Amino acid sequence: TYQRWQFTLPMMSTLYRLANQLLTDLVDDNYFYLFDLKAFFTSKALNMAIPGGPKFEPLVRDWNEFNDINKIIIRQPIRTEYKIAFPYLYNNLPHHVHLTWYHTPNVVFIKTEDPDLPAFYFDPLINPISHRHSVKSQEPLPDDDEEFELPEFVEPFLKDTPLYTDNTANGIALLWAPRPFNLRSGRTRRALDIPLVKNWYREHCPAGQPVKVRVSYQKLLKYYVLNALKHRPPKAQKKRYLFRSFKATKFFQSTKLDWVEVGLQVCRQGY
């Protein structure tokens, strides 16, 4: 039935490495701050655009006091990213507004370069420590000479076990991977539902790109968001089957052919 795969870590790491050209290098969720779906929803509803995100039909379409200019202090002028970040504050008459604003702590991840280099070493890209401060202070330190001594045997929890293994670094890196690579087992999926390039168009602010393609990125986001907005559950369900009905009836027979051969047969039949 070819559902539910379960692999070893080694398999996963090998597959990951094979896949690298198609894969996003963002380990945190911070890249996508106002480039996520929540922001797009907000943006839609307020009829705003975030500089390189999607535009939209406006959701729908008299003099006032606060508005008056003379009473307004302007140091910095209220940009649309603020309106989306804090849409119940900087924005009158919000409707259908979602709340962006979460802290996805910054992901600090060191790509390893070379096989040597044990999976746990201080990479040059860290920042050296150098604990420096006041005097240490004092603590009821129970000077020896008193008495006492271990009855012997007990030892640190894992002693024969080494700290690290040839797979250790790879195993750790499997922890910070995009979705299909972080798991040993899973359920099999149809090939159609595997959109290899989704994370390419979700990229945040490219620049150096000919106008034409930047528009295409904007349009792909528009499709993305609309699908997410539109996503009713099935809402009602029937398990009716077609090929099982056809196959149970004597007018159909079954076999196995070369795909190519079937294709040819279908074209002839259609003609």
Binding site: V108, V154, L158
Partner: protein, 817 residues
Amino acid sequence: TTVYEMDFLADLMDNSELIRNVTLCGHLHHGKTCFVDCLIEQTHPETEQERGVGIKSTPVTVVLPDTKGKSYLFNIMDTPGHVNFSDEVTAGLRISDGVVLFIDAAEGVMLNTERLIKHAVQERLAVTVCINKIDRLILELKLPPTDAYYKLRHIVDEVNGLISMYSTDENLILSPLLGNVCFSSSQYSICFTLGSFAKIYADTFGDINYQEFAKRLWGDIYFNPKTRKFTKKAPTSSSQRSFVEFILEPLYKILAQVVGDVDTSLPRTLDELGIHLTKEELKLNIRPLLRLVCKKFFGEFTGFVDMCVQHIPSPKVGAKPKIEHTYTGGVDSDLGEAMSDCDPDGPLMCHTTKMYSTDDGVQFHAFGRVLSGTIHAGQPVKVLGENYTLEDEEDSQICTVGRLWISVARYHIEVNRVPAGNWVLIEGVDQPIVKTATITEPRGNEEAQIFRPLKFNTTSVIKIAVEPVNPSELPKMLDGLRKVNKSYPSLTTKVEESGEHVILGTGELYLDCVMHDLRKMYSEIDIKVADPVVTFCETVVETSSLKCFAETPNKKNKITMIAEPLEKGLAEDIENEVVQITWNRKKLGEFFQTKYDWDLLAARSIWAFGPDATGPNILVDDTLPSEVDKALLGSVKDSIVQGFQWGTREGPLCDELIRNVKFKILDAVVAQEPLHRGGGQIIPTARRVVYSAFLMATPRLMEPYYFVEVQAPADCVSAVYTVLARRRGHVTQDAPIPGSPLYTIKAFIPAIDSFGFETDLRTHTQGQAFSLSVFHHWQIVPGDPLDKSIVIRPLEPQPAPHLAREFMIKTRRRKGL
């Protein structure tokens, strides 16, 4: 659109030595919440949501066992970690007895940890630290175990620096050796103390002593296998400090096998560890696997418990530390003693420092820590507002108690009665309270005093006007506003003369959710909102040339008064209460004379601190031959003080608070036996006098500034600088974070220019930088507020040389006119 043990719960509640109140805190995203989540998972295998940022604090009461199997009752306040919401943390801190601060291992100590340590120490609470997210030193930073030890020690050192900064006595310094420190990872349900980790060694192995081991693990102690005894280093060879040898190395090995292998060798490692897993469990995805395995290895969640039980005093100790600061009487003859014993008895007492809402209805249940005695359902109770004093019967309402509840996280346990030391929700005492309130024996003789109302770490600065779309809906909106005043602690509202309804907040995020609450829940009415603007304060930069002296409305009294600036430190000290008014002239003068070279005579001449009991302004009388008509002077002096207070509360320029100014009297003319004439006429006159001195010689505006901490990669530091340049900011300090590939930027930025700052920063860096900002510092606005030669273009932003004029005029146009 818990039956069996609650009895058990009640038993625990009764005892008062099995219960403790503790607080989790630390910098944004260091894993406080996942720790609690994972704890709850073990315990019960049975706007915030959408944002992912904690905003409102949550009270959780739970029954937890220590390493010896003794159960306790814990009252845990889970506060928010965003710096804009520190208001709720102060609420928590008033209620509780100690505090747990956990700093994410990979981040280090950050802005809000520093502020919270300061604050909790000043609140006389007991301080412990859980370092969370130790997994990030292994799985993410991939440090060597040796280096992770260094990093951990650095954290400890930094916190000790901070703590020593604000505590007169080093009674407490934190070292896992003393039992003040967790090393944990809530995500993977690993949580231990140096001691409780030793328990693991003993219980798997033989008789070896639990405590003698533990005390010798942390801190440049090495272990010679030949000796069989731990030693100050004598092995030149290079053997990892014993924390590494016995803890971090095997912790790494456990994690490494599970992430790294999990198929090839993981099972045997588990046999060595003594962990049996089933086939199902071993087929799991790696992060859940890690959590599983560590749950088996590392126990229930002991360390938090032991730390709290040993170092937090408990309520029984409770009141005496608590009674001192909180209670206006401060104890002496009756009630202070009563509070201190804490036995349910006598008057009963309560302190309300929160109002947790109910979504469905207008009414909300109040929350507080029962100080003495006990509350029962339906008992009539007497409310004390913060305003009410000893003989102010008017403000003290009474009502009954609908239901009592004990709060698990977002569950409401009904109960019949609640004893002293415990936290409780009270239904029915809602309508008559606003923010802080105390609950007392109702219409029963005794007498009462109210606990000091909440002091906050921050100052509210950002001002928003609010107005409903249809004027006929106004009262609904007003009702809504009342509700949010109860809901949020520092959220301050006011209606200013134009009819403009104003909300003062701490910053953008805060205010956004205040608006959210208001529009979405408390009133369905469509609401207009004005652009964010800050408050300003008013000051003087030089001694007045000449002094205007106002005859009273009755032409009977004259007051000659000048004004000049205070040396910065004075005002800052005045407010902190270090120099505060209560001490006898002898003491006060000694302080000022000693610290600022104040004149003895001038010291003697000090009357009052103006607007607030602790306020920036000072009032002083110096006219020696004429002064020595003190009796007459005395008669009027208090009315002058009241005029002063009122005049500095209210503003000659922008109708704002006057800051950092000394007012000094040179000539007292008072009618012989001033009568009602003097009594009534002088106050209005005095306000005039104050203004006249101020304006004549020599006003300026004060803009509030924020302190900004930015976390960011090396590549984007320049971008941060650029942003601050755009907003008139200026940077203080730019330095890499020890042990982690990021830089920290500290900077300042004017409040007005702070609007949208965060978001522009983050946008220009592609969400790599992140900025926190908190009010920190007031500072004079560059221009001259009073200069009619300056022509203001109506919409175009002005240059700095005359911002003062722009701000002044527009603010006056907004209301003062």
